[PDB]
Each structure stands twice: as structure tokens, then as C-alpha cells.
Amino acid sequence: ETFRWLDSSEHRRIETDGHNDYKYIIHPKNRWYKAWEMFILVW
Amino acid sequence: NDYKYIIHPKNRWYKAWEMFILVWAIYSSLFTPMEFGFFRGLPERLFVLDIVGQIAFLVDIVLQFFVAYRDTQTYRTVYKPTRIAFRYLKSHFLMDFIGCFPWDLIYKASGKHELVRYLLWIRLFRVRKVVEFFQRLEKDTRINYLFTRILKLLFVEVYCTHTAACIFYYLATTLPPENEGYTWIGSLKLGDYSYENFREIDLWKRYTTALYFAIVTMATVGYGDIHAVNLREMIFVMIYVSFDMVLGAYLIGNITALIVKGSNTERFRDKMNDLISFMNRKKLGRDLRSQITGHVRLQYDSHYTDTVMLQDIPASIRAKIAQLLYLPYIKKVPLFKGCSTEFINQIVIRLHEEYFLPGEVITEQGNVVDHLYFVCEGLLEALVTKTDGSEESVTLLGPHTSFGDISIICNISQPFTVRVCELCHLLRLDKQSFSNILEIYFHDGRTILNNIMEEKESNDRIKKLESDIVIHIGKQEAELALKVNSAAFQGDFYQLKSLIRSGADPNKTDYDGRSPLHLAACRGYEDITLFLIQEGVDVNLKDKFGHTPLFEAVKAGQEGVIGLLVKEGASFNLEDSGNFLCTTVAKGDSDFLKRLLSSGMNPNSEDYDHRTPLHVAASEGLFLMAKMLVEAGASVISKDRWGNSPLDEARLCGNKKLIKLLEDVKNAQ
Amino acid sequence: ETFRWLDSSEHRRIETDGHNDYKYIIHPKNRWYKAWEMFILVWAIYSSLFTPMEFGFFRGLPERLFVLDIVGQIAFLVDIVLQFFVAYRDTQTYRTVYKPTRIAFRYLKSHFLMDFIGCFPWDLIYKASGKHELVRYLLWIRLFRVRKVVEFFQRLEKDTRINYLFTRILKLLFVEVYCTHTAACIFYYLATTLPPENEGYTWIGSLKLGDYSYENFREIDLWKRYTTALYFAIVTMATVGYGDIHAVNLREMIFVMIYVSFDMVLGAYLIGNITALIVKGSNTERFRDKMNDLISFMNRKKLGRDLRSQITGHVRLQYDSHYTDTVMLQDIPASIRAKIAQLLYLPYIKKVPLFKGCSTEFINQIVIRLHEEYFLPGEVITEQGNVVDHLYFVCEGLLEALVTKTDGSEESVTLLGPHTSFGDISIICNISQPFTVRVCELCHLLRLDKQSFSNILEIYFHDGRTILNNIMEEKESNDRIKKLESDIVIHIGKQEAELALKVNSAAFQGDFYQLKSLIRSGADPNKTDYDGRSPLHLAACRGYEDITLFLIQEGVDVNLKDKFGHTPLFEAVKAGQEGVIGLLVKEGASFNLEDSGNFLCTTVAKGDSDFLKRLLSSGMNPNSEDYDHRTPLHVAASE
Amino acid sequence: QLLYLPYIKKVPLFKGCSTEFINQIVIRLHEEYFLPGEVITEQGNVVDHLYFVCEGLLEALVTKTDGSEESVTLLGPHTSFGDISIICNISQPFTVRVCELCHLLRLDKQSFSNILEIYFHDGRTILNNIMEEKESNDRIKKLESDIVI
Numbered sequence A: 001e002t003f004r005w006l007d008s009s010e011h012r013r014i015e016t017d018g019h020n021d022y023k024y025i026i027h028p029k030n031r032w033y034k035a036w037e038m039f040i041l042v043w
Numbered sequence B: 001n002d003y004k005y006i007i008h009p010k011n012r013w014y015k016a017w018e019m020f021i022l023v024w025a026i027y028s029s030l031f032t033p034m035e036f037g038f039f040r041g042l043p044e045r046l047f048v049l050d051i052v053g054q055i056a057f058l059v060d061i062v063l064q065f066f067v068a069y070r071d072t073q074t075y076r077t078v079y080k081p082t083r084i085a086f087r088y089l090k091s092h093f094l095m096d097f098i099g100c101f102p103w104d105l106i107y108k109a110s111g112k113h114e115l116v117r118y119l120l121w122i123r124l125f126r127v128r129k130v131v132e133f134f135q136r137l138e139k140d141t142r143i144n145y146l147f148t149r150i151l152k153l154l155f156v157e158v159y160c161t162h163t164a165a166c167i168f169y170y171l172a173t174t175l176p177p178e179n180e181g182y183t184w185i186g187s188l189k190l191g192d193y194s195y196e197n198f199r200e201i202d203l204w205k206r207y208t209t210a211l212y213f214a215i216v217t218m219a220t221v222g223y224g225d226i227h228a229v230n231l232r233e234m235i236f237v238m239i240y241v242s243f244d245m246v247l248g249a250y251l252i253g254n255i256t257a258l259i260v261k262g263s264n265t266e267r268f269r270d271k272m273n274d275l276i277s278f279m280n281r282k283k284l285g286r287d288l289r290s291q292i293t294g295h296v297r298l299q300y301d302s303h304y305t306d307t308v309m310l311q312d313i314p315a316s317i318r319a320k321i322a323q324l325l326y327l328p329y330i331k332k333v334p335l336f337k338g339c340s341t342e343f344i345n346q347i348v349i350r351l352h353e354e355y356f357l358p359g360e361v362i363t364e365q366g367n368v369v370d371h372l373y374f375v376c377e378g379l380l381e382a383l384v385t386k387t388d389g390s391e392e393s394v395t396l397l398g399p400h401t402s403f404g405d406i407s408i409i410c411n412i413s414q415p416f417t418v419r420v421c422e423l424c425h426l427l428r429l430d431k432q433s434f435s436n437i438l439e440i441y442f443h444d445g446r447t448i449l450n451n452i453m454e455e456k457e458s459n460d461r462i463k464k465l466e467s468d469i470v471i472h473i474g475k476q477e478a479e480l481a482l483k484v485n486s487a488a489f490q491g492d493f494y495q496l497k498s499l500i501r502s503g504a505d506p507n508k509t510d511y512d513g514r515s516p517l518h519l520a521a522c523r524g525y526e527d528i529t530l531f532l533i534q535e536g537v538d539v540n541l542k543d544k545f546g547h548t549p550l551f552e553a554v555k556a557g558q559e560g561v562i563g564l565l566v567k568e569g570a571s572f573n574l575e576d577s578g579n580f581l582c583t584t585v586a587k588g589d590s591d592f593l594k595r596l597l598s599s600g601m602n603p604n605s606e607d608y609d610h611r612t613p614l615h616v617a618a619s620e621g622l623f624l625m626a627k628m629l630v631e632a633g634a635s636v637i638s639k640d641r642w643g644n645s646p647l648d649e650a651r652l653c654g655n656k657k658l659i660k661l662l663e664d665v666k667n668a669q
Numbered sequence C: 001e002t003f004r005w006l007d008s009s010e011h012r013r014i015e016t017d018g019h020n021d022y023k024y025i026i027h028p029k030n031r032w033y034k035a036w037e038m039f040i041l042v043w044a045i046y047s048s049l050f051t052p053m054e055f056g057f058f059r060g061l062p063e064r065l066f067v068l069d070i071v072g073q074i075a076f077l078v079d080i081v082l083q084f085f086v087a088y089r090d091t092q093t094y095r096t097v098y099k100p101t102r103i104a105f106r107y108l109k110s111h112f113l114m115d116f117i118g119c120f121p122w123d124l125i126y127k128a129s130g131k132h133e134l135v136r137y138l139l140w141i142r143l144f145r146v147r148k149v150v151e152f153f154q155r156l157e158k159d160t161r162i163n164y165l166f167t168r169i170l171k172l173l174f175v176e177v178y179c180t181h182t183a184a185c186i187f188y189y190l191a192t193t194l195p196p197e198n199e200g201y202t203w204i205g206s207l208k209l210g211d212y213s214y215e216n217f218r219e220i221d222l223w224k225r226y227t228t229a230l231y232f233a234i235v236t237m238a239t240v241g242y243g244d245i246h247a248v249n250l251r252e253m254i255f256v257m258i259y260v261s262f263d264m265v266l267g268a269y270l271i272g273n274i275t276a277l278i279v280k281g282s283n284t285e286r287f288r289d290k291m292n293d294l295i296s297f298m299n300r301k302k303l304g305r306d307l308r309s310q311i312t313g314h315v316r317l318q319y320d321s322h323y324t325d326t327v328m329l330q331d332i333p334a335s336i337r338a339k340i341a342q343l344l345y346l347p348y349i350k351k352v353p354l355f356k357g358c359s360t361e362f363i364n365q366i367v368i369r370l371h372e373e374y375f376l377p378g379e380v381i382t383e384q385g386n387v388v389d390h391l392y393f394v395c396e397g398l399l400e401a402l403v404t405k406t407d408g409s410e411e412s413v414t415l416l417g418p419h420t421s422f423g424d425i426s427i428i429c430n431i432s433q434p435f436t437v438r439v440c441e442l443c444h445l446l447r448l449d450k451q452s453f454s455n456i457l458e459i460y461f462h463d464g465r466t467i468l469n470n471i472m473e474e475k476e477s478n479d480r481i482k483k484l485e486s487d488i489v490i491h492i493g494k495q496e497a498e499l500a501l502k503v504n505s506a507a508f509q510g511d512f513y514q515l516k517s518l519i520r521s522g523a524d525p526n527k528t529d530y531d532g533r534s535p536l537h538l539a540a541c542r543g544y545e546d547i548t549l550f551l552i553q554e555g556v557d558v559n560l561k562d563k564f565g566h567t568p569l570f571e572a573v574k575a576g577q578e579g580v581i582g583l584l585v586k587e588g589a590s591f592n593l594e595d596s597g598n599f600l601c602t603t604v605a606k607g608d609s610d611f612l613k614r615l616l617s618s619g620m621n622p623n624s625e626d627y628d629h630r631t632p633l634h635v636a637a638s639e
Numbered sequence D: 001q002l003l004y005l006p007y008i009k010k011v012p013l014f015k016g017c018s019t020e021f022i023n024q025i026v027i028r029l030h031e032e033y034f035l036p037g038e039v040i041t042e043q044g045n046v047v048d049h050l051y052f053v054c055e056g057l058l059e060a061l062v063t064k065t066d067g068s069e070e071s072v073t074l075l076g077p078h079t080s081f082g083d084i085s086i087i088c089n090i091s092q093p094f095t096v097r098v099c100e101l102c103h104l105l106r107l108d109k110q111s112f113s114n115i116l117e118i119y120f121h122d123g124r125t126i127l128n129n130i131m132e133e134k135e136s137n138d139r140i141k142k143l144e145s146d147i148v149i
């Protein structure tokens, strides 16, 4: 029943999947990925 | 379909011909203004193109005589040829038949008159097929409504610009070539190019020039490099701009109307936007804000189960929906066990789905409830509460359970604040509809009252002969006991059984005793008494007069029902039996006393004076009945309150023919 | 309080003010006067279109068009004096006033002088008074004859056949044109206001379109100058504006700056009214709104592919044809909805063969609780082997009752055409539905519930017995399938066998309203079946009343010996009781009882001074005796 | 208290009541209008609202089975039908039609029972007024309704 309620639900589980491994992957809502998303926006 | 030569309109080989003649009608109604305006008879390059093209619309006329249609008043497909023929001949045959005449060959073989060339303007009764295509596309939910509502308005603004360009060039051709300077194209010079002697310019330069004027005019840009100089072209562009002004206003109106009539996503978006503005204005917390947003998102994503979308669908279709969705969730409920299927079909119609997040509150402690809830999924809990903030998890209401039924039938406030611990799927049912169908179906309300008492063993409120739901049931059960007793009085054995098999009880009594066994025994209907005994009845039931059905059987006189009641526990239990036996000796009806001590009361009982019935029998001379009264009675030595054995009482009667009986029990000592 | 609402009530008072006196004042709905209103509307349309063309394009009318505007002024001079004899359909006091001093007034202080100045000859006055230019500006008074066109669009806005937001669009489209006709006439007049030697500094004297030069422009034909000016004004109104014709003077620049500022507001108002018409949605998008609201809840509930095609079929049936507007009808109260139902359904229910001559109140109670329903062909309504929850009456269409033997042998039992009912032989009975009622043609069934046709069937017991007699006076249902049930529910006694029991249970429970609703409709007996009881034997005494009014009604027979030998005085005195035995004795109650002496000796023997003093106080002679002829003193001296 | 209070003060049901009870009554009223001829209550029904006439000439008639009727009274202004069907929990015995342009004031039965159970001295005064004006032919007891309990 709750699998119908996917995005209308708890939705905050990024904490475990943050830095499992791979050591390079930048989060989208970073701060250095907001000095790029405006610099190359005005580019 | 007993014809086999009539095509169904929803065929898959005919629906490939509709989209073929749609393409041929999109072409042949866009070339027809170009054939009227830009030529004066077609060249020999386009002769074969004009011959086939009036043939694909000539076999379509024949094919429309062999296609069934749906009737408008009976909604049946009409496969009759003489009906589809007379439907085609009176609706669309004439404008499609004279439209596919070879009008160019009729023009060239009539001395080339210009008025026989205006007759090819009835080939625009082929945008009828585009109109029918858009009408079929509007009555199909697979296609979007922003793809259809203005796309058909960006089609009239193609047709009425191409046609206006063709008429605007045609008006330039209506003046002779000596008067070319007084025309819109003859007086035209764009750049270093001059459009003089314009009928030897190639077709696509003239067409692109006229269409450039028509589209720049239609968009109300209007550069004025191309304008009208004549007095016929002034009139035409006045008509044309006064038509495209309201056409552009209609386009802006349709786009604005489909923008201001937004989807439910935008309404929910602005609702969540100003709710988030209220939550950030009031400085709310973290889990509280998530609870508010989750509740309104649950309501938006789950409000689609509202039954007010369905209140034009008829009953026995809404009932089938409610029996497909809700009936397996009501059949497995411990409250409704033993209830008939009619009551459950009346239950499932008036149910409303509800969803709650894990932590909201459904019912509260101090409140009398107004909805009976059924749990489909979820793991709701029941919390009684004290004055000093205490909580006690009394009951864990899982799936297949109900709460609030005790607070409706007994009309009490709710005992438990019901908080929900999971994502639940509750089913509302208001107390008014529940109570109404309880006093409508009282034979199932009695079984509900018997189910509500057991689980709680009536923790309290047990008589609960307080709320009407528990009264109206008592009143209807009483009047149905009256009705089944009237059926049992006269011979209505089939009617009696139809009353009993409709959920009755053959043990509920009348206003003063009077079970159906009582009336069936006093009337002597032996089959009815067999049905009542094998159904299961208290055969020793008493009245407000102190009467058993055995007593009414022996008072009536039918020995068959007398013998039929005594094969079970007949058992008279009659109080004041002594004075009753003495007063039936007093009335002296000997066959009634034969019925009395046949299988019954002991004849050694006593009246207010301590005397046996054989004492009062042997006081006037009643040998024919004193013989009967001495048949089973014993202990003949018994004195009165006066102190008299019945032998010395039988002495002074003055009749000696019953003293012959007095030498009978002289050996039992 | 009808002075507060003179609009909701007192709408059409007609009687006492049609022919008061004066016999001349025409009501403003006469067929001979509304044939003059269209005539003066055509004259007003012509005289308002020709007036700017008379002003701008001429300096005094020629020798022709003289009889034309003479009769144009005569046809309005007639209408000037004709409105002194036309009534005064009023605003606040809703009655057509016939008083011809409130007809001369309300007109003289209104459109009279603007309509009497406009009938003076202003081109004979012009040519008589030395040909002055400012006496020709009084032709513009004749644009007050657009009242007759704006009154036509007010008598059309309150006409319900055409949408009011469409008459507003037609009114704006008659304001858009005639403001391009008047602007064309003023734009040509502003070119004639310059001398003919300064004609090269005008919009038309400095014009050259194609190879034709518009020089010496006062000698061109009138229909070339008018078409040129109107072409400018219409391509300016549409905001196309080619610029082949443009303003040249300052007096033309000022007029174009006024005119495009007026047309911008007018075009924005036209776009707004068209958009306001379109947002009031059509039939197709109001179908598709709830259709996409019902495709979802059919995709997530996972309904079957046949039930989905039935639901979509019924939704496409309530739209696109057969506009069942009960959802609009629900604002109307129950009394007026009952009057609507008695108008619409009584021609159909009275011709049903089930109701062969019942009472009119019973058929009224039937048609109060009816619902209209439409079904496509191929639908199954009531299938064989299920309980019947609704009673259906076929108003129009064609149905089909079928039955199967073993292997789906669907043979046509009957064909239920119009004025037929099905589901009737199983609400009367308590059996299953015996036929699969399938739909052949598009039907219009009238649905009655099962519980309504049990309440109004047990209330109206004479009509219920008439309905059972209508069912049995048939071929005993061998026209259908010969499913004979006994003889239906047979005569089941609701005359005396259950109604005396019903009124006796009403007396036993103590319901006075049910008691008097039963007995004031007749049928007050003195006997119960299955016993010798009475509505006096129950209520009065044993119950001891509940309700004090149980003894005064109808004066029923006291001293009725029941099946167990108890008079109602004995039942009132056994339960002791002290109101009915105080009250029954003045009504002539008696203590008749067989072996009363033996009963008194037994009440001596048990010992009950209250019981025996209530026996003796309510009338009892203690010299009656028993089988041994012993008085109650002979046993009250025993122990 | 300035729109409805002169109407509710001169009601024979609320005679002798405290002014605070009337001030609690007048808040929950709903102004209603009816043209001369509709029906607002029927023959057998426990009524859902208590009404007060302000300017109107409603009639209260009892219907029979065979279509007939007779008016037991003529409810003019400053009258209150309803209440005896509410506070005795019985059905309203009269089909209350209307003969003029009436000016009723609704009051639902749950809120009326709430104000009666909170202010019980005025409830006893209302019970006394109904027991003398209806004359209390029976149910001087009237413990069938939980309001009196």
C-alpha cells in the first residue's frame, strides 16, 4: 500500500547513500557546484 | 450483421481509408483556391493530377453507401442498406457529388465562361472531413486537449490565409492587363524587382507574394509594401481584416481560457505555496511542517476516490463498484458476522475512503462520534487518557476491525482516543445512515447487537435498551412477533415459514405471553406445531395468565396435539391446580377432565380448603367422573379442613351407586 | 413583507389596470406595435448610418435624396407623437402605467427634445440661413436614434434563447463598426475643412494609390471617397495600418490619436468579452474534465475492461445527448420537485399495468420517490439469481427479459417496451430475481427503491391488496416463465388479522399518535385475532395507559368478555391501577366474571388486602359463592 | 442582539427565561425566507431544526392516508414550531406548510440541546412553558428525551 506512496512520503534517506565509496562524486546542492552553475550559466 | 457486404464504421480497413481521404481532402481543399485564383484553366501538366483526385472522392461516394451508422435514438448500428442510403442522400450526397465533377473540363468546353468557373468553390465541402476528424479527435481521451483546442484554430488561420491570398490575387486578375497599374501586384516593386506583366511571373513567386501579404495582414503586422490600390481590393481587405480581427480575438481567448483553466497540479502548487508561506510566516518546527505538507499531499493524491464524481452513474453500477472495491473488506469484519447479504450491500454503498499518516488523530476521548470506521490497512491504536496526561495503549486496532460502533448503538461518547501508527486506509460510515439501515434491517441489527455484546461480554451498558437503535429494533421485533403469531393462528404454514426464514425468531412473545406454539396448539394445527417444535421452542413457556401450550391444547380438545406435545417436555406447571381441578369437577364436563389427567397434573392437589378433588367429586354423586378422577389418583385417606375423609362425605349424598368405588385402595397399605 | 421584495413576488399583476379608461394607451407588447418597433428600428439604423455620411461627404444634400430624408423625418415625427400613447412598464412598482399624464411626463423630461430637435430639417435650414457651417453640426443630434438599436440589444439580452455574453459580443461588434463608419466620415470631413488650393496638405488630396492620383478630390465619385476613407478606418481599427493612407495635417493627427486610443480600449474589451464567453466552458470540455477525473480512479482501482466501458459509456451518455440536469435540479425544494415529478411521471406511472386503478395519493407517493436513469444497449440491469434492490418502470425504450435452462440458452421471455415494469414480482415476493433484464434499445427507466416500495406498500394496504390482485389476475405469470408463487403472497389479512394487531401493539407500547393515525382512518375493531383481547383490554388496563387519552377515544365497548374471561375492568384492577378503575366505572364498567366467588376465596387464601379491597371497591358483591356454596366470609373465617 | 433579539424576546416559548440564555440563542440563528406554498416539515419526522416566525402566517396541518388534510392551528408571527418534537424526542405530528411570505429563523437541534443542557434553569422554564401552553395532555413525565434527563 505504501509503495504507491513513494514521493509523497518520508523521502529523506540520502544520509546512508552520501559517501558509501567512490570519493569524488559531488552533491548537486553543493556550494562549489553553485559557483559553477552560475559561472557557466552566464557563459 | 446478416448482410456481410455492409462495412462497420469501426473497421480497421475502413479506418485506413478515412485517414487517406483526410489527406486527399487536406490537399484538394488547399489546391482548389490555388486552382481558382492563380489560373484561368489548368495547364496540361496538372490534367492527370486533376483526373485522379476527383476519383478518390468518387469511390468515397460509393463507399459511403456501404457503411453502417449508429442510430441517434436507439444507439444501435444500422446495417440496413435502404437506411444508410437515405441517410447519405439527405445529408452529404449532393455537395459531395457535384463537387467531384470535372469543372475544369466543363470550363474549357463551354466557351471559357468565368461564371462556370466559380462552381469549383463547392470543393470546400471537403473540409467537412477535417471538421469530422477534429470532432472525432475531441471525443477521444487518448489525445491531449492542448493538442486539439487551438491546433484546430491554427488550421482555420491556415485555410483563411491561403484562401485570402488566392482571392487577393484573383482580384488582381479581374482587371485587364492594360489596367495593370491599378492593381496590387501590377503596381508592386520590391527592391530593384518590378512585378510588371505579372501573369508571366512563375507561380511560386506570385503565390509567395500573395501569401506574404495575407500572413502579414493576418498577424496585424502590415508593413504596407503590399497593400490594396483598387476599389475591389479595398473592399476585400476590409472584409478580411474585419474577419481576422475576431478570429485573432478568438485565438487569444481560447489560449487564455485554457491557461486560466489550469490543471490540478497548479492548484495544488499554489495551495502548497501559500501554505508554506504561512508555515514560514509563523516560524513552525521541522516535523510539524512535514506533517502538514504530508497531510495536504495525502489529501491531494487521495481525494480522487470521492463519490461525487459518480453521482450520475446509476444504481446497480455504483453498487457493483462498491461491491467490487469494499465488499471483501466488509465481509471480513468481526462486527458484521452472520449478517445477511442485503445488509452488507446496503453497507458498502455509503462508504467513503480515507487516508491518514502515522501520527494523526481520528477520534478523541471526550466527543460522541459521528462516523463508524473500518480499518482496511494500517495498525491504529486505541488510547484511553486520564486527567494528568497519562496514556494507556488498550487496544491495537489492526486490519479487519472497526471502532465507534459501540459509541453509536449505545449513543455514548467515545472511550478511546484513536491514534494511528501506520499508513491507514479507513472507511467512513456516518452514524445517521448506519442507524437508518439498522432500523430498516432490524433482523441484522439484532445480530449486530448480539456481536457487540459478546466481544466486550458487555463490559457495561449491557441492557443498552437505551439508544433508539436498540429500541426501534425491539419495537419492530415485537410487531413482527405479532405478525408471525397472526400467521401461526390461522392456517398459514407457508406464510409462517416465509416469516421465519426471513430472519425471525420463533421465541419472541406477544404483548402478553402467546408464543406461536400457544396459538398453534390451541388451534390444533399439527404440522405447524411440528415445525415449531423441530425448529426449537420452549414448550413450557408461560403467559400473563399462567398458561402453557399443553394447557391450551387440553383446553381446546385436539388429542393429536395433546399427544404431540407430551412426547417432549410438556410439563403443565400450572399454579392453583387444586382449585382448578375442583372447579372442573364443579362444571362437571367429564371429557375436559379426561383431557386433564390424561398425561398431566397430579389429582392430589388441594384448594383453599385442604381437600382433594375426589372429595368434592364424592359430594353430589359423580360416579362417571369420580371413576375418571380415581383412575390415577391415590391416597384416598385424606381429611378436610373440616376433617372428613371422602368416604363419609360420599355417605350422606343419598346415592349409593358410587360407594362401589370405595373398596379400591384397600390393598396398598 | 412583499413591499421588501416586489421582484420575487407580485411579478405579474394583470387584472385591474389593462382597461381603466382612455381606451387609447397601447400596451408595449401589442402585435401591431411590435410591427412598428422593427420598422422604426430599420429607419433608425438607416438614419444613424446616413447622418455621418450626410455630414462628412456633402455640404448640403443635393436635389435628389430630398424626398428620402423628408420621409425619413416624417417616419420619426410619427414616432414622436406615437409615444404619448404607449404605456409605462415600470421599474420599482412592477405594473404598466396607463395614466396619460405619466406618459407625457417621463418622456418630456427624457428623450423627447433630443428626438424632436432631430426631426427639424437641418439641410433646408442650412440652405436657408446663408449656408453657415455651424448649423450643419446639428445633424449630429440624429445620432440619438441609436437608442432604438441599444434598446433592441436590451430586449435581446433578457431573451433567454441567446446567451447574454454573446449579445454583449454582438453589441461590441455593432459598436466596433459604425465607429469606423463615423470615423471614416469625420476623417473625410477633416480633409474638406481645408480650402481646395491647400488640398495637397490633406490625407486624400496628397494620395496616390497605384497609378491613380486622388487630386481634385471633391470631383471623385462618392463611393470611391467613402470606400477609401472606410478602408483607412477599418485597417486602422484592426491595427494593421499599412500606411498607404495616413494622417498628414495636425487636425488629422489629433483625430487619429483620439481614434486609435478609443479602438485600443474597444479591442481590449472585445478580447475580454470573448475570453469571458470561452471560460464558461462548452459541452465537450466539461465532458472531458470529469472524464479525465474518472479515468484516474479507474486506473488505480484496477477495474475490469468491461466495467470501464460501461462507466465511460454512461458518462458519454450523460454528455453529448440526453442532458439529465438533476444536479442543477437539487437546489429546488422537495415540494416543487414533487410538483415537477407529478407533472413528468404521472403520465407514465398511471399507465403501468401493475397499478390497475389505485388511489391517487398512492401513485403520488410512488412518483415522489422516482429517479430517471438511462442505459445503453447491451447493459444488464437485474440478473437472474440476485436480490432485487430497485423497482424499475420503463418509460421509453426497449428491454428484454431472458432466462437460462442449463447451458446459457438465452431465449426471449418477453420484450419490456414502454409502460412496463420489472422487478415487481420480487419485491412483492421474497424471492430472487427470475430474469436477466437486458437492454435492446436506449431506455429511460424510472427507478424506485425497494425500501420505499415497502413503506408505501405497508402504509397503503388497500392499494397493496389491489396490487396483489393485479398480479394474480393475469395468466398467473405464465406469460413469462410460469413461475407461480403460491398465489403470490396471498390475501394476508391487513383488514383485521394484522391491523387490529397493529393498533393493539400501538396501544400496548403507548403510542397515541400511531393509535389515532390508525383509528382516524377507520378500522377500529373490538376484537383481536388469536385471542379475545381489545384495544381497551390492552392499553387501558394492563398497560395502564402510558398516555391518558387512551380511554376518551370513540367510546369503545366496555365489558367485552375476552377468550380468558377478563373484562377490561378486571384487567385494570388486577394490575391494581387506580385511574382507569376510577374512570371506567362512570363509563359503565362491570365486574362480570364466572366463578367470582371461587376467585374471591382464592384471594382470601393467598392473602392480599390491596387486591381484595380493589375488587370490592370497584364493584363486587361478596355473597356470590363456589361449588360448595361458601361465601368469602366462610373462608375468611376458616384460617 | 440588535437584529434578532426583539424577535426572540417576544416568543411565548422563551417567557421568563434569563437574558443570557436569549443572548446565547440569538447567535446561532439563520435567517430564512419562503414564498407562500412550499413545505418545510412533513407528517412523520423528528424535526431537524427549531424555527421562529417573525412575519409570516404559516399553517400546521395533519394529513391522512386518503389525501385529505385539516389545519390544527395557524402559526402566525412570534410563534415557534419545532421544540415539542425536539425536547420530547417525538416525531413532529404536523406537516407545516406556509401561506404567506414568511421570515423564519432556523436553529438546529444539536445546538439547541447544547444550550439547554448548559443553561438548565432556562431549560426548566422552557419545559414549564411547554407543559402549560400545550397543556401537557400526557408526558408530564417526558423522560423519553435525554434533554429532560
Ligand SMILES: [K+]
Residues within 6 Å of the ligand: B221, B222, B223, C240, C241, C242, C243
Ligand atoms: K503597420
